[PDB]
């Protein structure tokens, strides 16, 4: 590559792996969004929350792809595995599964940042800090806030409805 | 002091004491605000209410400081003791603690006003009446209103959530 | 904590300590501001400079508190010790004391950043870099600029007046 | 008087006396203003400051007169004695004489307020608090601020000029 500089083979491959995690996460959120749009679930505010997250994760993958090219690395795509469940249970179950998901992405970002420091790749460390580390921390705080309110509310059906109407 | 007139040593020292009470109250409200911002408490409306009160109390202390200088008294600062609790319990517990706090400030204002009358210091009596006595009475009525609604609502988790969403 | 990830007990406690340093600094600036508002000091431009810094330091503490909660750490408040002096001498003395203060905050930020690197906590390193490290360097340069001009001007009374009127 | 109620003969006469003090003060400020407008004094900013104060004192007397009529008291005018000096010396001398003047008005207001309390005349106490007590305290603080700056500046001619140009 004519532009490639200070960009290790190891970081390049981890970037490709992170891109797959983000697309998988996006797919997961798409499944969660449509589940809450079912006529027998019907929680529009929950459906919207997850559909907005699917788009965010897709945007995250696209930013990683752009960065890959900017550094002279080569994007390599793999199969995207289907989401973990076909049915997501209650709003609470789903929000727990979402937080579990986000923590997995966060850890992958932390490991990638650790790889970058190990490889003396300040550009990668900066890129992660700029569009990912804080957005992930803020997203995780919000989900934790939601889990707490959802838990405070479980007369379970009444609580689930109120949360969707008044918070979402 | 070239400007000092009709400003007793006793009122000056009580003004300094009141300034410390107001800063302490502000610190208390800051602790209450951040407690309700915890991911395991997550009552944004309650967090906002207390954070707004912290700023008000800080503004109250600053007005007293300005007045101290206007009269030719000398501001003297003391340590600010930490708030009474590290964790504030429920919205109800916190609002009870807040009302207890406000009543203490109110009594201090009443005592200071009584000192001013005893010392024939009409300017001090006027200053207290203008920015403090009524604001305190109105604030205390509002908290009492809130305590009543919070109490009416305790299915405790559902009530606490509804109060924060619909009143705060 | 349900959200806590990669957030060490050591960083959490240092964050609480830094929050206390910032509130103390704010208190210090409040005392400096009101001292220059005394009828026997009467340097409005100096009073304004310090009062603006008190608010900045308070905002700094509040940002640290928010971050603490975002990471799932627990805010713990301590007594706020009173400022080092009751009277601040000349504009020069005060600006020297301010620079000494800022350097102490800066060093605390540097130590906290070093702790974060030692703990592999990129989010903390990023947060410090974003709202604190540069703001502190720029503030310290400005004070150094002011000290130099104040020193160039000391006919001491005439210089102090001119600085307050033409620079502040 | 058909409207007179709770308005003692003693307060009525003190109101007439205060009206004379305020007109005298106004006359004093007029003399100070024109002295600084002399071609051999020529401090326009000082001339403006005093001319603005003459108008304020005249407005103060007029408010007392209106109040006198509102209460059913009878305005009685006396000779207005000429100002204490024909020539006012330096800006410093003049500002010292002004502060001495204002303190005399303030004390007269305090005594009148004390008479009103002694006579159980809440309307008079309120009227004094509303347009006079605080305005007087704020005016006296400003003069004290000016005296301090003027004193800091005395190369006397250079200081006097700078004060008039940069503060007034």
UniProtKB/Swiss-Prot annotation, chains A, B, C, D:
It comes from Equus caballus. Residues 5-154 form the Ferritin-like diiron domain. This is Ferritin light chain. Pfam families: Ferritin. In horse spleen the light chain is the major chain. The keyword Metal-binding applies. Residues 52-59 are annotated as: Catalytic site for iron oxidation. Fe cation binds at residues 52, 55-56, 59, 62. PANTHER family: FERRITIN (PTHR11431), FERRITIN LIGHT CHAIN (PTHR11431:SF47). Stores iron in a soluble, non-toxic, readily available form. Important for iron homeostasis. Iron is taken up in the ferrous form and deposited as ferric hydroxides after oxidation. Also plays a role in delivery of iron to cells. Mediates iron uptake in capsule cells of the developing kidney. Delivery to lysosomes by the cargo receptor NCOA4 for autophagic degradation and release or iron. Keywords: Acetylation, Cytoplasm, Cytoplasmic vesicle, Iron, Iron storage, Lysosome, Metal-binding. InterPro entries: Ferritin, Ferritin-like, Ferritin-like_diiron, Ferritin-like_SF, Ferritin_CS, Ferritin_DPS_dom. GO terms for biological process: intracellular iron ion homeostasis; iron ion transport. It comes from the Eukaryota. PROSITE patterns: FERRITIN_1, FERRITIN_2, FERRITIN_LIKE. Oligomer of 24 subunits. There are two types of subunits: L (light) chain and H (heavy) chain. The major chain can be light or heavy, depending on the species and tissue type. The functional molecule forms a roughly spherical shell with a diameter of 12 nm and contains a central cavity into which the insoluble mineral iron core is deposited. Interacts with NCOA4. GO terms for cellular component: autolysosome; autophagosome; cytoplasm; cytoplasmic vesicle; ferritin complex.
